[PDB]
Design a binder for this molecule. Sequence first.
Ligand SMILES: O=C1N=C2CCCCC2C(=O)N1
Length: 163
Amino acid sequence: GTSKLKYVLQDARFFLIKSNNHENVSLAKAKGVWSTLPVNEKKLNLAFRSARSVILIFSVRESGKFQGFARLSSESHHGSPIHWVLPAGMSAKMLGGVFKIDWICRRELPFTKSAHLTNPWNEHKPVKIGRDGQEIELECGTQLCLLFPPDESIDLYQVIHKM
Ligand SMILES: O=C1N=C2CCCCC2C(=O)N1
């Protein structure tokens, strides 16, 4: 059912994550971690102390899809190294701290199914459009997450307890 999901999302904040390759999103799914450049690191840390839920929604460039969404369970901290595949012109020290995350949905969602959702914080372009880190406004954020196929392998009871 959808009810506990609607509970987790209540008064959440949402952020579009754009990844260059599937390899890093797979690593995020397996280890429960994400890291960003300092510009986004700072904004995620503010949002983490400002809302009961900060949701990251992941998209792999050129995939035509979202790959799932997760909630932050900590602010960023500097631990066990993470063997990210780094783009041309980037090294591991340029990355910021490591955010812990609890996945809420690990299934895909194709852009064709979110083509009625516009993001007011990005000039009302379709929600799929946005730079890495772009905030998605509350109402669009919620409906985007509800569009995902349910992930019956996830139990939001433990997630609810961290709120
Ligand atoms: O915000 C970013 N997060 C990541 C995560 C993994 C390395 C590539 C990467 C990046 O280039 N930018």
